[model samples]
Target chain A: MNFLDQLDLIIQNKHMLEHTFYVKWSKGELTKEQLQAYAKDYYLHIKAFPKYLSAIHSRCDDLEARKLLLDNLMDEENGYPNHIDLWKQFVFALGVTPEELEAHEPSEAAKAKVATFMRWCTGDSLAAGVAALYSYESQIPRIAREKIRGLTEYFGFSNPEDYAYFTEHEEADVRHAREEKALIEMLLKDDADKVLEASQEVTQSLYGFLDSFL
Target chain B: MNFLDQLDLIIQNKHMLEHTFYVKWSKGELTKEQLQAYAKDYYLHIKAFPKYLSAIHSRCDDLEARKLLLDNLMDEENGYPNHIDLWKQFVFALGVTPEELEAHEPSEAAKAKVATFMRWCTGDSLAAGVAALYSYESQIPRIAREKIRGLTEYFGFSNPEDYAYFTEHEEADVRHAREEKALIEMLLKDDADKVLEASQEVTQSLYGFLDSFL
Candidate 1:
């Protein structure tokens, strides 16, 4: 397989959750309680995602790549009501209190997912870092669409305000994933195995995170 | 040579500024202009050093190593006259205004030194991070002592407040280096080459920082 084909296979092979979670969510079998539980665990990953990007940013010496990563970071962190705040809106819409969200203890599975990504971001080679970041970012647009569909079609969440996180991600992640995919394809031209390894690691760990929700 | 001996050799070999800069400083060959310029650059490294430690602390999975790094960070950041504040004192002693100290654009050499360490601490293995930190820190007590001696004995800066930065570092860095050395020794046992490479990188970069002053 070509590099892109290999990447797509790794992502597709490990990503089984769109049907598992989204199907239940679309059928109204997924409850607010499950989401709340998932959110409490997933919040740990949300808060950590930017820091993982920063770790990569700090090491990225290529000017163009650095600029692109910085742009992604700015989107994640800058402006009032940043991405984390948008995530909180979704949590609040599910009836989770802000205090509870802040104080919630994440499950071990959730902690491991964040920790694993961070380790990959910081401890791995530059190509690996890029691949690790690309692994999740490339999947976000599709995942966000599933989430929005589930929320709007079955969960009775019609307010754009409550679903802004998913909607914005659906739009923004397309650009983000493309930029990351381009960068990964360019940078990992000589190191497909390294990229594949890092991508598979992230995909497997993400599978663990989604499996925890089940 | 063993890891500790190899580390000491790297530090002891590359560290020649005491004989060069401090000698000129003690003989009054260094002018306020030189000191001022040096302080501006050195201050950048000083302020960033804690953040570098923080990068390691955040990724440090070992409980004991994490605690030790946090202690090092707290010491660098906390206290009535924090390390940054004390560094500003030295900058002030060199006739740099508070505004200039805050607004000064670091020289390329200054920025590279800090940026290199941050990359090492954030983008390298845990063992590499510990080794990179130890590379600069292990030599600091002696460096601080040299500065204190030159300031007080030759420069006629007798005020305790004027030299508090060096004085405090003289005492604190001993403990800091000891803790870091212990951690590095323990953690890098399986990855001696990584430790050596990181230490050598930091040492070379620090030499570049000193060479900038010349």
Candidate 2:
């Protein structure tokens, strides 16, 4: 199979919705208090995710690839409401104070997940890091859509202003993931296995992260 | 023991100058290639350090504490010549191109060191994160001074523009560290041990980072 098809299968097999956390969240089984913990625990990943993209942007030699990553990073850091700020709104709506979000202790699963990405992005070959990043980016659009559905349909959060993070990511991440896939295709000629391996590692790490909430 | 005094003792025991990296730099034993690697590896921390400070600033509930961290963060991020830009000049002087510096792979030690700080700052308690930040900030003034001395006396670099990173930190870090110390004293109650443990861990991690150059 082509790398994209293979990657899609890998992600499908360990889809985030299959995680008990998302399952519970979607069915409205998770309380606001639980969501608060979830929000805070996930903050570690949210805060560090942009830096991973940055590492890839800095590591890549191809100007076109760097441009693609930079556009993603720019959107994360700049514009009307950056990704972090948008996340802040979602957490705050869940009753998480700024201070609480800032000082929350990330779960072990969360820390490991972030560490896994940092290792791939900073230690492994540049293409490997890019593939690892693509793994997560490709999954996020679907996750965001499901999360928004959960928030509105089950959790009684209707205002787009409060939960714009999921909506924004649903739209933005699809484009981001597509660009990342193209970059992977361009960069990995015969090294598809290495990229696939990196993708698999990150996919598993993300699964572990989600499983922490179970 | 008082937090500051105990923290001071820990740093004294593991003084950064004693690290083989700095010792070699001082004695003019490091080659341009080694210095280039050092510049690139160190750049990873320089780029991410500001965000760590921002994390603390956002997490802090006390206005005074937040203000202190905000000033430090602003200095790192804002100003005509931000800390990262200043370090760019240093790296450029060492013959590293902007592209190379951006994309360069950090050493295992450097990555671990950054990870250690990230874990402490983002995964630990608020006061602990603050203490970890202080651990590095406390030592930077002296480290910067020694670095400048080595650059001028041993490395044949005398231009202020090229070495402004060290000189600026030399002046600014003393104040920054002091402010951070004050914050720790104000915010941390009987939790000296918590802060102290975090400080010691960071001090050793930093020493390990410097020792990686050996």
Candidate 3:
């Protein structure tokens, strides 16, 4: 099998969409407090997401790779109010206070997710870095789609504007995923094992990241 | 005088325009090689600048301040081509190959610039962090003006479109500087000295950042 196929297998098994928390979320079984807590913990990842891309872009000397990565970075930070603002809106609608959202400290699982993503992004192999980035982003579209269904069917939200957070990612990460994969294809020359290792670790870390609220 | 006036003075003293490299650049006396090297070193900063703002935003629980900081981060990272792309165009025009520019390492002085800005942006006080941000950005308009002038006068460039990197920042940093200043004003409260200290260190680091090419 090709590297991407194998990588997809690793991700498929650990896909955050299939996690119990998200399963419960999809069924609308999660209480408001559970949703609130999830939002709070996920907040850390949402905020760190762009910075992680920037870190990879910064270390990359490949002009084409850097340019592609820059395009990804711009979309996150641009968009007027931006991604963080969108996340805040979603949580705000869920009844999260600004104080509470900002003040919330992520659990150890959440912290490990960022730490794991970061180590690979800045560590030795650029291939590993993009693999780690790709691992999570590739799943975001699936996860985001499931999330929107949960939000609508379970909750009372009827409009796309109500949860622009998921809407934005559902579309944006489609593009981001393609670009990140291109980076991995270009970068994954000799370190095939590293990419697989990094991708698996990140997939596990992200799945664990969602384990906190339960 | 009040804090902003005092802060402005510090920025004015170490304004990048007055630095020897830029002075020579303004007068059109530096060789193309020197200009090439300057672009290379400054590249590291352009890439890291947004990440620095993001770091500050992540740590800041103050929603108002975080929103403002995110705005600043968006402008740097957004705008389609983004700041880093603009910088690459400028440097590419200076005769540095993509390989050369990407592969070049920053001198110790330039390294210190990012390291120092990063520490304060995530350190004890948010006021101090914005102060460091203001220190450099407050001078960008003036520096950018001189830079564009040199490009048109000394170099063969005759149009704003040719040197968009400077043009973009000339206007953008005016807004950015203002926004960052408001942040400092809101955050400054009892940490005036810390703000002053951080601004001076950042100002000095930027000037020292330029000292390398000479």
Strongest candidate by TM-score:
3
DockQ, Cα level, model 2: 0.04
Across B1-214, the per-residue lDDT of candidate 1 in tens digits comes to: 6977888888888874554665687666787778889988888777666667657755654545655765676677654577878888988987889998879889999888888887778765877888888888888888887777778766668688998888988889899889988988666648878788888898888778777777
Whichever of 1 and 2 has more TM-score, that candidate is 1
- What are the lDDT scores of the predictions, listed in order? 0.77, 0.78, 0.82
Candidate 1 lDDT at A170 equals: 89
lDDT of 3 by residue, A1-214 (tens): 7888788789888888888998888878989888888888888777877667766764565656766776776677655678888998998888899999878888888889888988987788887888898898899888889989989889877767779989989899999889888888887668878989998899888777877777
What level of docking quality does candidate 3 show? incorrect
Per-prediction DockQ comes to 0.05, 0.04, 0.15
How many clashes (backbone N, Cα, C below 3 Å) per candidate? Answer: 0, 1, 0
lDDT of 2 at B55: 55
What does each candidate score in C-alpha RMSD?
Answer: 10.8, 9.0, 4.7
List residue ranges in candidate 3 displaced over 4 A.
Answer: A24-41, A54-77, A80-129, A150-164, A186-194, A209-214, B1-4, B16-130, B146-164, B185-194, B205-214
Candidate 2 segments whose C-alpha is farther than 4 A from its true place = B1-214
State fnat for each of the candidate structures. Answer: 0.00, 0.00, 0.00
Q: Which lDDT value does model 2 have at B71?
A: 68
Most DockQ-accurate candidate: 3
State the number of backbone clashes in model 3: 0
Show the lowest summed lDDT stretch of 10 residues, model 1 chain B. Answer: B58-67
